[PDB]
């Protein structure tokens, strides 16, 4: 049956639990192709990489059970909206869906069209010139010789500006999901296991705990997120200590019409018309959903690069504030500016303390030598600058800091004075602390942020080198046999299987659960995470007998 | 051969082959491998900062262009920001080689309605082109020197810890006196391994005995199983101290 099994091997998926004896127990599954596909999607087997990074590196180990299962969670939800989105009123309906789900398959696109049309629109206004005469006092105008420039730069700036506006409409269509269902997901999350609404109240610290309380009484609570019954489940949990008919209310439920519609409902025929569509929309969830959506970080430059767009029509120039999208443009441009952003309080606070030093000179330089600041080669009229506290401190940290010898060279020379010696000693203070200290520091807190980003790199991949991320055992045991350790990681224990496993118990019926789906099922409603292998494996187990 | 035929034609095109001498010294390559080694990232960075000066040159096109004339006699003006060329230009050539940035160039702003204003770009341009673009020049080659000392380091630190065919560490085999030592020189040697797969293609197929006839009818399937991984002569013969 050699042949069997080859056309089969893709699609069988094995995985090691803890089962409900003391002994770890081996599960055999189907895993669909197109499942398979969407895993080796690039985008999806990147993320691996990121949340392998965030587990390694500023991440716990009791937990990480917890954050991969998260993981899978969120991997799932972004498979089932690829999949969504692959490939007078009804045709109005499907016109529009079909352009959104352009827009959502194209959305990267839009982003480089935008670029190009970015720099072809900085490119042409290097031609701009100023004139006292029209082509009253300035006549800003493009001075060119080869024609067609400035329809050429109106069109540009038109079609960066719709571009820009269908960057706006897919990012909406396509990334917010996942940010709604990760809130209402933790959202429940707290709301079923830690009854932070039901036990006590979210602190004043926390804004998102305030604006959380909104959606309670909703209709529409348990939207974009898998389980429906929350609501039931918190009522359940808490209501026999907190009072049922509290629990009720603070949830918007109504345990009487919940009882009744179990007992025998009539469905009445739903309207389709836009009248009683304004009320079938749920002013209170939008509400909740605007809030939640207006504080994210992306849609926030997503505005501000389409009110600069807009901007460019009153004046041309400000479509060179679309430049700095290089910088999260390009993948390699934000490493490199992750030196600068990390470790940078550093950088803030030694150039504010720059400004101490600098007003402790001004004091000593202004109770005196202020003879020496005098910058009027003539006699007719002088120019004193530390005649007052205000000047000679901006004396000081405009003109003497961007100096390369110091103060010294600025000032009069201090030779045939009775403050000589005193002047040579404040000179080369000045120098000597403002420009070869407090610089040194500031080059070697981003070489050393360059240092430790490698350091972070080079040690993720010696973790995960070195041993296994389920069970944990190290690679020495499992290389006694030859490849013991590759194959531990590629058969044995492996995340792809373990995502696949959960999606697929939560794709089957419940009614089709075997008894150790049905187990895995059971612990898993509960947040238990202890199926998982933890120090044990399969060849641990059964090291006589050859497992 | 090009450059030394055009070397007739002009002397000078002979000066072209003291580059010879990059890859000419061994060490010489060396040291410019830290620069060539994570240059991209220079090349990026350059590239980077020919941005920021062009934000620079708009704020200063718009308005502070009274301050760019260059000529000392009221004769003529030689203003260097009338245009979006020229001033483009200037800033780069001239205020990015500047020690003190770009305010000791153009007239200073005092007396002036737009002080403040002067100032502020003086001190950000200084703080931004001249202390923090050029620090991240310094410690990427800083830093390609440290990262390939680092993997000299681990490449010797790898071939002194554990055999390079079993992966065995030094530890078991460190029981007996010299016993790394012993099993590197004489157990499983690279040389060894070497003139054995000569031997074997240079001596007669109807030679072979029959375990030189396995090792070649396993080599030409390009198996790689015979050699021996995560085993030893010493640990399958443990008892009776092989
Ligand atoms: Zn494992
Ligand atoms: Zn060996």
Request: glycine share 6%.
């Amino acid at each position: 049956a050699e042949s069997i099994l080859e056309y089969f091997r893709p699609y069988l998926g094995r995985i090691e639990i803890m089962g409900a004896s003391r002994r770890i127990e081996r599960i055999y599954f189907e895993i669909s192709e197109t499942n398979r596909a969407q895993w080796e999607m690039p985008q999806v087997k990147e993320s691996k990489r990121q949340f392998i990074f965030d587990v390694v590196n500023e991440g716990g180990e009791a937990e990480k059970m917890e954050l991969f299962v998260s993981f899978c969670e969120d991997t799932i939800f972004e498979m089932q909206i690829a999949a969504q989105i692959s490939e007078f009123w009804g045709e109005l309906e499907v016109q529009r869906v079909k352009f959104l789900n352009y827009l959502s398959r194209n959305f990267y696109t839009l982003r480089f069209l935008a670029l190009f049309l970015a720099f072809a629109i900085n490119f042409i206004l290097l031609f701009y010139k100023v004139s006292d005469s029209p082509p009253n006092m300035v006549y800003y105008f493009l001075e060119e010789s080869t024609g067609y420039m400035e329809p050429a730069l109106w069109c540009l700036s038109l079609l960066h500006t719709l571009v820009a506006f269908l960057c706006i409409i897919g990012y909406n269509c396509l990334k917010v999901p996942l940010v709604i269902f990760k809130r209402e997901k933790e959202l429940a999350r707290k709301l079923e296991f830690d009854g932070l609404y039901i036990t006590e109240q979210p602190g004043d610290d926390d804004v998102k705990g305030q604006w959380d309380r909104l959606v309670l009484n909703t209709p529409s609570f348990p939207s974009n997120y898998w389980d429906k019954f929350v609501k039931r489940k918190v009522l359940d949990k808490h209501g026999d200590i907190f009072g049922r008919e509290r629990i009720a209310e603070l949830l918007g439920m109504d345990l009487a019409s919940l009882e009744i519609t179990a007992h025998n409902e009539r469905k009445p025929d739903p309207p389709p018309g836009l009248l009683t569509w304004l009320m079938s929309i749920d002013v209170k969830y939008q509400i909740w959903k605007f809030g939640v959506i207006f504080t994210d970080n992306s849609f926030l430059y997503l505005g501000w690069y389409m009110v600069m767009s807009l901007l460019g029509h009153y004046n041309n120039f400000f479509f060179a504030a679309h430049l700095l999208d290089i910088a999260m443009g390009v993948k390699t441009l934000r490493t490199i500016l992750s030196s600068v952003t990390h470790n940078g309080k550093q950088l803030v606070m030694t150039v504010g303390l720059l400004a101490v030093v600098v007003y402790l000179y001004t004091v000593v330089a202004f109770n005196f030598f202020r003879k020496f600041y005098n910058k009027s080669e003539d006699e007719d009229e002088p120019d004193m600058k530390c005649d007052d506290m205000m000047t000679c401190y901006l004396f000081h940290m405009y003109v003497g800091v961007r100096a390369g010898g110091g103060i010294g060279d600025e000032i009069e020379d201090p030779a045939g004075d009775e403050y000589e010696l005193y002047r040579v000693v404040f000179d080369i203070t000045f120098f000597f602390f403002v420009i070869v200290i407090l610089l040194a520091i500031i080059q070697g807190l981003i070489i050393d942020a360059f240092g430790e980003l490698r350091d972070q790199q080079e040690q993720v991949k010696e973790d995960m080198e070195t041993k296994c991320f389920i069970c944990g055992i190290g690679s020495d045991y499992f290389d006694t046999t030859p490849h013991g350790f590759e194959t531990h990681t590629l058969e044995e224990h492996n995340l792809a299987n373990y995502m696949f496993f959960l999606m697929y118990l939560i794709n089957k019926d419940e009614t089709e659960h075997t008894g150790q789906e049905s187990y895995v099922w059971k612990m898993y409603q509960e947040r238990c995470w202890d199926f998982f292998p933890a120090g044990d494996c399969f060849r641990k187990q059964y090291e006589d007998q050859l497992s």
